[PDB]
């Protein structure tokens, strides 16, 4: 697909940041190496459900004033294409496949089959969690349902699973044409308190490590690489300075389009014609 | 002359807050005596400026 690393990072960082900040012992583990008073002050101010201060995330160049006490500024950077395929053919498909998804589901009995229902039509099934079927189990997929023979499996009549699968758009042939790009995004934790900037740096590094395992950047946005700048005053001529430490996140990812092929051939036919010269 | 020309103001005097971290040297961000500024203020004084 076409991709937007900045919007991915914003969408991914915001919930993760919230879920760490609402959970005190996580911060208590992340900041174990800092000075005791720095740790306790940060945990008192920003952390837990009762926290009176709050962190914020957003892109650069807003028209309004931000929460300069603690704010992650996201800032789309450079990139370059790095590796190309022969013919620019990144892949080919017989059935137009969408995004990868993971969904929780439960088995149910139906007509002496077990079935799992999924919210969308299954274009491909990658894994039913914790199950490997035998041929006897007569595994079949149909529409948005996975179906599974009941006879030997009655104990599992309410078994709970996670389905990893991917959508289908439509039944069509084509070529995925495109290339790989290596692209940079900068993130900086602004604070007018230097110890807050240092803690926001630690929290961001933890978040990015945790992010490396996510499906989003396992399937796309691969090879996350981190670089770190000096701590410096971002703005120097207010009633106080504003500090931050930049980090650069670099990703390798595919830019591509679905070139559908309308041509289809369904029968050869043969004829002999005679040359009398 | 100054009392005629100046506006009434409240003046409060700066001092460094004793909440500064004895190692890092930076203010505690949760300090109630100073709201994350390193500087605490004495009670206000009425003056004209
Ligand atoms: Zn203080």
**Resolution rounded to one decimal, in angstroms:** 3.6
Nearest chain A residue to B20, by CA: A37
Q: Sheet harboring A96-110: ordered strands across? A: A122-128, A160-170, A96-110, A113-117, A145-149, A140-142
Closest CA relative to residue A26, chosen from A42, A4, A2: A42
List Cβ neighbours of A188 (8 Å cut-off, separation of 6 or more).
Answer: A72, A73, A75, A234, A244, A245, A246, A247
How far is it, in rounded angstroms, from Cα A8 to Cα A2?
A: 12
Look up residue A204 and give its two tokens: 């961001």
Closest CA relative to residue A197, chosen from A2, A42, A81, A24: A42
What number of H helices and E strands is found in chain A? 5, 14
List Cβ neighbours of A270 (8 Å cut-off, separation of 6 or more).
Answer: none
**DSSP 3-state of A42:** helix
Determine the Cα angle at A198 with ends A224 and A185, to 5°.
30
Closest CA relative to residue A99, chosen from A257, A215, A260: A215
Determine the Cα angle at A135 with ends A134 and A140, to 5°.
100
Q: What residues of chain B lie within 8 A of the CB of A240, using their CB?
A: 37
Q: How many other CB atoms sit within 10 Å of the CB of residue A168?
A: 19
Q: How many angstroms separate the first and last alpha carbons of chain B?
A: 11
For B35-42, the CB contacts below 8 A with 24+ separation are B36/A69, B36/A192, B36/A193, B37/A240, B39/B14, B39/B15, B40/B14, B40/B15, B40/B16, B41/B12, B41/B13, B41/B14, B41/B15, B42/B12, B42/B13, B42/B15
How far is it, in rounded angstroms, from Cα A169 to Cα A123?
A: 8
Distances (CA, A) of A104 to A98, A124, A140, A159, A269: 19, 16, 19, 11, 50
How far is it, in rounded angstroms, from Cα A127 to Cα A125?
A: 6
**Which H or E element spans position A198?**
helix A194-211
Nearest chain A residue to B21, by CA: A37
**Are the C-beta atoms of residues A24 and A43 closer than 8 Å to each other?**
yes
- The technique by which this structure was obtained is cryo-EM
Percentage helix, strand, coil, to 5, in chain B? 10, 30, 65
> How much distance in Å is there from the Cα of B14 to the middle of ligand 1?
12
For B20-28, the CB contacts below 8 A with 24+ separation are B21/A35, B21/A37, B21/A38, B21/A195, B22/A37, B23/A35, B23/A37, B24/A35, B24/A37, B24/A38, B24/A194, B24/A195, B26/A38, B26/A193, B26/A194, B26/A195, B27/A193, B28/A37, B28/A41
Q: How far is residue A32 CA from its own chain's centroid?
A: 28
Distances (CA, A) of B19 to A44, A169, A260: 15, 61, 67
Q: Is A195 close to B37, i.e. CB distance below 8 A?
A: no
Look up residue A250 and give its two tokens: 């670099």
**DSSP 3-state of A102:** strand
Look up residue B5 and give its two tokens: 């020309």
Q: How many other CB atoms sit within 10 Å of the CB of residue A198?
A: 22
Task: Give the residue numbers of the binding site of B.
Answer: 17, 19, 31, 34
**DSSP 3-state of A245:** coil
Name the residue with tokens 């004829």: A271
**Are the C-beta atoms of residues A195 and A42 closer than 8 Å to each other?**
yes
Name the residue with tokens 């349902």: A145
Nearest chain A residue to B23, by CA: A35
Q: CA-CA-CA-CA torsion for A61, A65, A71, A76, nearest 10 degrees?
A: 0
Q: How far is residue A145 CA from its own chain's centroid?
A: 25
DSSP state of A40: H
Q: What residues of chain A lie within 8 A of the CB of B30, using their CB?
A: 41, 44-45
């Amino acid at each position: 697909a076409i991709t937007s690393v900045d919007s991915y990072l914003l969408s991914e960082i915001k919930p993760r940041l919230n879920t760490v900040l609402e959970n005190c012992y996580i911060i208590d583990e992340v900041l174990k190496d800092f000075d005791y008073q720095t740790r306790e002050s940060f945990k008192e101010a920003f952390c837990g459900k009762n926290a009176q201060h709050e962190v914020t995330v957003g892109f650069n160049f807003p028209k309004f004033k931000n929460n300069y006490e603690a704010h992650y500024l996201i800032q789309l950077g450079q990139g370059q294409e790095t590796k190309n395929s022969l013919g620019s053919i990144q892949s080919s498909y017989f059935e137009a496949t969408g995004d990868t998804l993971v969904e929780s589901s439960t088995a149910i009995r139906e007509d002496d089959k077990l079935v799992f229902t999924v919210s969308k039509p299954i274009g491909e099934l990658i894994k039913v969690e914790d199950i490997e079927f035998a041929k006897y189990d007569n595994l079949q997929v149909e529409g948005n349902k996975v179906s599974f023979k009941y006879q030997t499996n009655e104990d599992y009549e309410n078994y709970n699973a996670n389905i990893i699968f991917t959508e289908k758009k439509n039944d069509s042939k084509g070529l995925v044409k495109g290339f790989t790009v290596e692209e940079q995004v900068t993130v900086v934790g602004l604070s007018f308190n230097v110890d807050v900037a240092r803690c926001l740096d630690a929290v961001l590094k933890m978040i990015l490590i945790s992010m490396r395992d996510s499906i989003e950047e396992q399937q796309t946005f691969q090879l996350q690489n981190l670089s770190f700048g000096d701590i410096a005053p971002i703005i120097e001529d207010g009633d106080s300075m504003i500090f931050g430490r930049p980090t650069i996140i670099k990703y390798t990812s595919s830019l591509d389009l679905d070139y559908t092929i309308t041509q289809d051939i369904n029968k050869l036919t043969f004829k002999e014609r005679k040359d009398w010269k | 002359f100054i009392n005629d020309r100046g506006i009434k103001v409240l003046w409060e005097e700066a001092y460094f807050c004793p909440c500064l971290n004895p190692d890092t040297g930076h203010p505690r961000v949760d300090c109630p005596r100073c709201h994350g500024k390193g500087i605490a203020y004495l009670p206000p004084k009425e003056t004209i400026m």
